[PDB]
Design a protein around this ligand. Structure first.
Ligand code: MG
Ligand code: ZN
Ligand code: ZN
Lengths: 51, 49, 115, 67, 147, 46, 258, 196, 34, 528, 49
RNA sequence: AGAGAGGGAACCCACU
């Protein structure tokens, strides 16, 4: 996808304000490698805002 | 020239023998290190008695 | 790695009910109140208040697991008195006494700071 | 290394006490007198300064790699 | 949890669970334990030095001095440690009335509490956890890999 | 296009090239340290 | 069948701690108020740290951790701030965050202490608490520097320990254990509590079976993020709000069942 | 007493350990010579007149704590423990996380385990001053409670405080280095660093 | 004269002198030196 | 060579054909958890999100499996492989087009394992069949295998860095086979000694020993809090043992609520006097040390390890035989949960106050040590003057050695007995020893009174030097302190010579432990 | 290694003060691998002339 | 929307 390897910012939800890198992306959701925690979590594309 | 023989640190023929702690900190070597180990291919080796 | 996020203690999600009522079938007039995303800091007071009713035959609460944030409050009341009524009266009594305590604490602050 | 900001048990702000603790030590006080001169009643707050080693001063001797 | 901690007496053990401060028990003052260890780890292993270290730790943290724990001293026995601890408003043998963190009712037994020196070992659980499902396969024989 | 490296003991910075022997211009020190990245970092203060 | 009337008697009120007695209430109510002191009181703490540059001996995440535990003056702003995740803003705004900027480079041979004073806020009210000296964040050698922008957001103690306004909450009931909840093997060895009222001849009070826990003694010492009395006021308001929301969901569930 | 007076004022009189060896006060005794020596444990007990044991001592032990090794010297009250426990602690002591070296930021070590806020022990020995364990420690002083509880400190496990951990309690940092070089060979295979 | 009962603090002075003069790794360094 | 490739323990026959690497297996550290059943293991999410079960698409589960496929991989409920009717594998981690994500009856879906799945849990030295048992999967957040407490005893896993292996049965047939054969409820009673292997572990055992005492009374609120954790409670609060003054339930009533069905057992407490059943009070025990469970209700007695432990004829063994095996699983879970939750109110500890006896006991210990030491010395002076006569059957030196060992052993036993008469019934060492959960009387004697004689190879400390044990002793010194007898205790601390001799004894024990393993394992392999 | 005998592994009496009695690898190398005591010093040797 | 992986052997330290 286009979103793969793009630094994104969760702009909605419990994880709001986190900066991460998209590992996998779909039509609906996308996995984000969080820069802060040692964990990769999946969020909706509507909640993501690229830098 | 016969050849090169390894030197364990903090010896009498190592570079940092008798150097002050300030000089060691200038060389990025801590004064806390007791030496007594060889540097072979970047690996620190200890000769077990 | 497998660390749960810090907001799992108090934040619900879509499809999660804050309170779930399940009528017990072992004894008459008993219900299990499953409170999601809470801990002892609610169930303990609810249990203590439900013990003050003369019409509650059993008032207890337990956490199934400390790593999963939910409590179950089991209430058995006397017949002719619904346990849900006891629960909604315990909540109101707690709110009343806490508001009274807050007002009295305000009065105490005014007394202390002004001599 | 550097002094913790909060006492691990209490959360009492102890990170602002270290330099004053050293000043009271060099002013010829005992360590307990220095501790309760800084106002640390609970021993869990007292161990934060009484057993701290200021290692960052050792870390600052080396020249910074980036410049 | 699963991270391997140890005392200075061979009293190792992984982290069973982590409670927040409000769930952890507390004394008459606001002091909560950082670590809660098993009482059953003592009697068979017989690490009385762990208890004496804890008692001397209370004395040291209250007195404001780093305590001395040389093995063969004869100037520091448990009775002198208890007498020094009694002067700081504590029980003779380091026991302190812990209040329960959940119910608030004070614990019937008097919990032995105080500061020890704990060491975090190199062994985490993230370095040791691994699962596998039809992954890489050896070439010499078609069996799964090692490690 | 050139990558800026910090010259170890020299602590100065210089350009580098592809297939370029790693040498400083001040004293020819062999150890270079790559500069910190230019992209943003964000840390949860937990 | 109803709630007893509690009363408050404050023994002292200082800028650090508040010491008071709550009488005529249950044990669970008293313990919950203590737990709400520790956890459910919301304050303002740094949670979003962006390191623009860093050359200090301490690494980035260590500095971000130390910035997290710094207490902030949130005596009146925390009631106005929305929770960051609840705000409809563009992922950050002055209604759910407070901006801090640190920009320090050491240009002298002296070890320069980057303290809590170098944290510069845009909101004049939300500033670090530090008479007392400042909170040491990181020391700097000559040539080292750190630049960062830190956003502080509203949160409470359950989320993280950096949102804990209380330094220590001492709580005890029945200091002479007339209830005999705790059973001393030898009560002579046991020191008396601060609130004991027995003569030195007597060790512990006589047992009464009809008694109940009452007259709870509190010693709430704040860390400086809040005044010790507004911690109690916010705690009581928060506990009442939690019960009110629980009642609202209870009413919805009951109406759903019927 | 004069030896102690000249030994306290070191760096001024230049009176070292070798000067005391030259003074005929201390000497090195090996294992063969220990078979033919009458060794006093401590002077406060084995040189005062009593119902005499031997009264023919030749040497005196300096201090019994010097019979232990480097890792058995960091154990507080090791004689109050059981010997297997001391051995196991000696195994664990070479494994505790901590600041292993002062120049760890320069070293490209593989599996570097360092700690955020290491502390010196409140309960220490005199021998830690000479291993410099108070300058590069490994561990944190913790307020432990030995209590049966919910049931997670059951069989050699410990219950920890989440808030304390959130305050930097034992929060370590793990470094791992990766080395790689290219090989200039006979033109058949040629490694080179580039973005593929 | 002699050290009657201040011996407890007098022995560790000589221990400190030994470990300031020799060190912990005299075996390795002296063996390689010789 | 080929022969070298086959002949070894790392060859083809043993290393590859007998014991081979297997897919669908996980290995991580275990940490305790008392809030899940004995047949439940709490596996992490990242492990469950990597090990898959091949579930066949049927019209009953076609909608559920369809939704899981729609989630795809890494959406934990989802799946990763979908297998066609002709054995064609389709990835779900690479996000194919939505067209080939349909499901008709016949497809296979390798879905991430959820709660209720069956796994095989084993430790490494599988010396018996209870070291490898089947558990039910429970998904818990953190990254460890949370398994129950009572399963520690068959596994011999003490959570101090132990990591276990978890195998997943892939077929449904083998899943049913494990459920019907290798379930831990079905592996409670072992065939090797017709006794249970689970038992009740240390902390629950001590807390239940203190719980079932006669002087334990519970307030109504505490009773309801305890009864909240009973899984087999029919919702009827029992009539209190004390009604009019302060309605107060006895702990035995709550434990009678625990005891399932109607089972009848008669056991004896660990501290039951042997002269009690001779005279009167044989049915009304003054010490409450006669365990009688009658008609499913605990009549009387304090339950030590001889009542709930792994001993044959215990309460749990009879619960297994008279009742079912699922009922025994509920019995174990109810005991652990409710006794732990009462232990929260009660609290149990151990400290330095439990290791100190009063000065009168210390005077008795020191007097006994002095008397025995003088007796050894006078035996020595008898041996020097040839006034000691040899026992028929051995030399004069051994008549001497037998006398010295006999005197020192008598001193150790007498001092231990005099020490263990002064616990004052609140000492936590006695609390753990009487319940039998952890420790023995010897540990109490060594902590309080005296460590005792140190031995190397079954005899005293040998003369390593020339006719002396250490250079601090005179030559030919056969006294107590010279030959390894330690008169100090762990509370007072050991002198350096006693410390060294104690280290010798510990070294001998560690050598025995380290050398025993390989020989025992080889004997087991040959036997099998 | 892997010897069933015990004499080379045991804590002999002459290990007093020269070698630590407690520290040892507790695996299959008990007593074989040892750690030197603190003040113990290995004689570097001189000429007998 | 281009979809798989390989090294191998040897020897040290620990882990239960
Ligand atoms: Mg183990
Ligand atoms: Zn340069
Ligand atoms: Zn906003």
């Amino acid at each position: 996808n286009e979103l793969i390897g793009q630094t994104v910012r969760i702009s909605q939800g419990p994880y709001k304000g986190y900066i991460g890198v998209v590992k996998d992306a779909t039509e609906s959701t996308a996995r984000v490698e969080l820069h802060s925690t040692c964990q990769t979590i999946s969020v909706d594309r509507q909640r993501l805002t690229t830098v | 020239f016969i050849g090169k023989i390894p030197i364990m640190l903090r010896s009498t023929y190592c570079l940092l023998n008798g150097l002050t702690d300030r000089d060691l900190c200038e060389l990025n070597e801590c004064p806390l290190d007791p030496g007594g180990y060889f540097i072979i291919n970047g690996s620190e080796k200890v000769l077990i008695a | 790695m497998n660390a749960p996020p810090a907001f799992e203690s108090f934040l619900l999600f879509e499809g999660e009910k804050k309170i779930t009522i399940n009528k017990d079938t072992k004894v008459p007039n008993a219900c299990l109140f499953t409170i999601n995303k809470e801990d002892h800091t609610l169930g303990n007071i609810i249990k203590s208040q439900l013990l003050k009713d003369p019409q509650v035959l059993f008032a207890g609460y337990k956490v199934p697991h400390p790593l999963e944030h939910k409590i179950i409050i089991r209430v058995q009341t006397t017949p002719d008195y619904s346990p849900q009524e006891a629960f909604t009266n315990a909540i109101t009594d707690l709110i009343s006494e806490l508001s009274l305590l807050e007002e009295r604490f305000r009065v105490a602050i005014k007394d202390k700071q002004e001599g | 290394m550097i002094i913790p900001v909060r006492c691990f048990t209490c959360g009492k702000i102890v990170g602002n006490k270290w330099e004053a603790y050293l000043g009271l030590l060099q002013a010829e006080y005992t360590e307990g007198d220095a501790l309760d001169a800084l106002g640390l009643k609970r021993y869990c707050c007292r161990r934060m300064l009484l057993a701290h080693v200021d290692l960052i001063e050792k870390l600052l001797n080396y020249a910074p790699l980036e410049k | 949890i699963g991270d391997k901690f140890a005392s200075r007496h061979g009293q190792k053990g992984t982290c069973g669970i982590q409670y927040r401060q409000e769930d952890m028990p507390f004394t008459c003052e606001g002091i909560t334990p950082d670590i809660i260890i098993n009482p059953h780890a003592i009697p068979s292993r017989m690490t009385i030095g762990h208890l004496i270290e804890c008692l001397q730790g209370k004395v040291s943290a209250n007195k404001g001095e780093i305590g001395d724990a040389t093995p063969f001293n004869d100037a520091v026995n448990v009775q002198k440690i208890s007498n020094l601890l009694s002067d700081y408003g504590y029980h003779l043998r380091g026991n302190e009335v812990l209040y329960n963190g959940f119910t608030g009712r004070k614990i019937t037994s008097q919990i032995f509490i105080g500061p020890t020196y704990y060491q975090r070992l190199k062994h985490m659980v993230d370095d040791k956890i691994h699962s596998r499902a039809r992954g890489p396969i050896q070439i010499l024989n078609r069996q799964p890999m090692e490690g | 296009q050139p990558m800026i490296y910090i010259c170890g003991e020299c602590h100065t910075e210089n350009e580098i090239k592809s297939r370029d022997p790693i040498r400083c211009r001040e004293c020819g020190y062999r150890i270079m340290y790559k500069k910190r990245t230019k992209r943003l970092v964000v840390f949860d203060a937990r | 069948p109803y709630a007893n009337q509690p009363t408050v008697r404050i023994t002292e009120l200082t800028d650090e701690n508040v010491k008071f007695i709550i009488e005529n209430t249950d044990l669970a109510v008293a313990n919950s108020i203590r737990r709400v002191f520790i956890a459910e009181v919301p304050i303002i703490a740094i949670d979003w740290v962006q390191i623009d540059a860093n050359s200090s001996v301490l690494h980035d995440e260590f500095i971000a951790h130390r910035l997290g535990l710094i207490p902030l003056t949130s005596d009146d702003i925390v009631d106005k701030l929305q929770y960051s995740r609840d705000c409809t803003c563009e992922e950050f705004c002055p209604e759910c965050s407070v901006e801090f900027t640190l920009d320090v480079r050491c240009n002298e041979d002296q070890t320069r202490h980057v303290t809590s004073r170098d944290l510069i806020s845009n909101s004049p009210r939300v500033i670090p608490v530090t008479e007392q000296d400042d909170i040491l964040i990181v020391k700097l050698r000559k040539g080292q520097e750190l630049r960062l922008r830190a956003y502080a957001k509203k949160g409470f103690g359950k989320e993280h320990a950096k949102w804990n306004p209380t330094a220590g909450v001492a709580f005890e009931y029945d200091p002479d254990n007339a209830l005999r909840h705790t059973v001393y093997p030898k009560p002579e060895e046991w020191p008396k509590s601060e609130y004991s009222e027995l003569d030195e001849d007597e060790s512990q009070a006589p047992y009464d079976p009809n008694g109940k826990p009452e007259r709870f003694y509190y010693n709430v010492e704040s860390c400086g993020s809040l005044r010790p009395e507004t911690i109690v006021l916010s705690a009581l308001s928060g506990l009442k709000k939690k019960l009110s929301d629980l009642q609202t969901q209870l009413s919805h569930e009951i109406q759903s069942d019927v | 007493k004069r030896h102690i007076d000249q030994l306290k004022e070191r760096e001024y009189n230049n009176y070292s350990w070798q000067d005391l060896v030259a003074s005929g006060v201390v000497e090195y005794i090996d294992t063969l010579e220990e078979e033919t020596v009458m060794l006093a444990m401590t002077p406060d007990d084995l040189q005062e007149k009593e119902v005499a044991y031997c009264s023919t001592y030749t040497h005196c032990e300096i201090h019994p704590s010097m019979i232990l090794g480097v890792c058995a010297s960091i154990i507080p009250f090791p004689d109050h423990n059981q010997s297997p426990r001391n051995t196991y602690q000696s195994a664990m002591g070479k494994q505790a996380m901590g600041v292993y070296i002062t120049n760890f930021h320069v070293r490209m070590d593989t599996l570097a385990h360092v700690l955020y806020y290491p502390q010196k022990p409140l309960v220490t020995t005199r021998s830690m001053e000479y291993l410099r364990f108070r300058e590069l420690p490994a561990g944190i002083n913790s307020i432990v409670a030995i209590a049966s509880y919910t049931g997670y400190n059951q069989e050699d496990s410990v219950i920890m405080n989440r808030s304390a951990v959130d305050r930097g309690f034992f929060r370590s940092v793990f470094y791992r280095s990766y080395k790689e070089q290219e090989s200039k060979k006979g033109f058949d295979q040629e490694e080179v660093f580039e973005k593929p | 004269e002699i050290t009657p009962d201040l011996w407890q603090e007098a022995c560790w002075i000589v221990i400190s002198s030994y470990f300031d003069e020799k060190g912990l790794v005299r075996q390795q360094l002296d063996s390689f030196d010789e | 060579s080929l022969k070298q490739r086959l002949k070894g323990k790392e060859g083809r026959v043993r290393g590859n054909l007998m014991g081979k690497r297997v897919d669908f297996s996980a290995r991580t550290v275990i940490t305790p958890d008392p809030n899940l059943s004995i047949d439940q293991v709490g596996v992490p999410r990242s492990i469950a999100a990597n090990m898959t079960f091949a579930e066949i698409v049927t019209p009953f589960n076609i909608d559920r499996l369809q939704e899981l496929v729609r989630r795809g991989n890494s959406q934990y409920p989802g799946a990763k492989y979908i297998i066609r009717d002709n054995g064609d594998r389709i990835d779900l981690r690479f996000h194919p087009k939505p067209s080939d994500l349909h499901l008709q009856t016949g497809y296979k879906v390798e879905r991430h394992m959820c709660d209720g799945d069956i796994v095989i849990f084993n430790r490494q030295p599988t010396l018996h069949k209870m070291s490898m048992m089947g558990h039910r999967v429970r998904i818990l957040p953190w990254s460890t295998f949370r398994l129950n407490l009572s399963v520690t005893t068959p596994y011999n896993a003490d959570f101090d860095g132990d990591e276990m292996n978890l195998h997943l049965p892939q077929s449904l047939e083998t899943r049913a086979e494990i459920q019907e054969l290798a379930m831990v409820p079905r592996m409670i009673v072992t065939p090797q000694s017709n006794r249970p292997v689970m038992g009740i572990v240390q902390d629950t055992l001590t807390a239940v020993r203190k719980f079932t005492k006669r002087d334990v009374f519970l307030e109504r609120g505490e009773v309801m809090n305890l009864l909240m954790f009973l899984s087999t409670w029919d919702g009827k609060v029992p009539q209190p043992a004390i009604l009019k003054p302060r309605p107060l339930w006895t702990g035995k009533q709550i434990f009678s609520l625990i005891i399932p069905g109607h089972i009848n057992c008669i056991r004896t407490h660990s501290t039951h006097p042997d002269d009690e059943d001779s005279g009167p009070y044989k049915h009304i025990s003054p010490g409450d040390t006669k365990v009688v469970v009658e008609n499913g209700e605990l009549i009387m007695g304090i339950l030590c390890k001889k009542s709930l432990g792994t001993s044959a004829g215990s309460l749990v063994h009879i619960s297994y035989l008279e009742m079912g095996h699922d009922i025994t699983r509920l019995f174990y879970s109810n005991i652990q949960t409710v006794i732990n939750n009462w232990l929260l109110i009660e609290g149990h500890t151990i400290g330095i106050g439990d290791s100190i006896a009063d000065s009168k006991t210390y005077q008795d210990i020191q007097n006994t040590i002095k008397k025995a030491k003088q007796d050894v010395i006078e035996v020595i002076e008898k041996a020097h003057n040839n006034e000691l006569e040899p026992t028929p059957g051995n030399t004069l030196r051994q008549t001497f050695e037998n006398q010295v060992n006999r005197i020192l052993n008598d001193a150790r036993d007498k001092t231990g007995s005099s020490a263990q008469k002064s616990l004052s019934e609140y000492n936590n060492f006695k609390s753990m020893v009487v319940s039998g959960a952890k420790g023995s009387k010897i540990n109490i004697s060594q902590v309080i009174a005296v460590v005792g004689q140190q031995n190397v190879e079954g005899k005293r400390i040998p003369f390593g030097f020339k006719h002396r044990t250490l250079p601090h002793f005179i030559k030919d010194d056969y006294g107590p302190e010279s030959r390894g007898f330690v008169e100090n205790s762990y509370l007072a601390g050991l002198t350096p010579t006693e410390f060294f001799f104690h280290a010798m004894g510990g070294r001998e024990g560690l050598i025995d432990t380290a050398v025993k393993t390989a020989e025992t394992g080889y004997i087991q392999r040959r036997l099998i | 290694r892997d010897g069933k005998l015990a004499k080379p592994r045991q804590l002999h009496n002459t290990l007093w003060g020269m070698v630590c009695p407690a520290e040892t690898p507790e695996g299959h190398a008990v007593g074989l691998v040892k750690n030197l005591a603190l003040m113990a010093y290995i004689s570097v040797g001189s000429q007998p002339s």
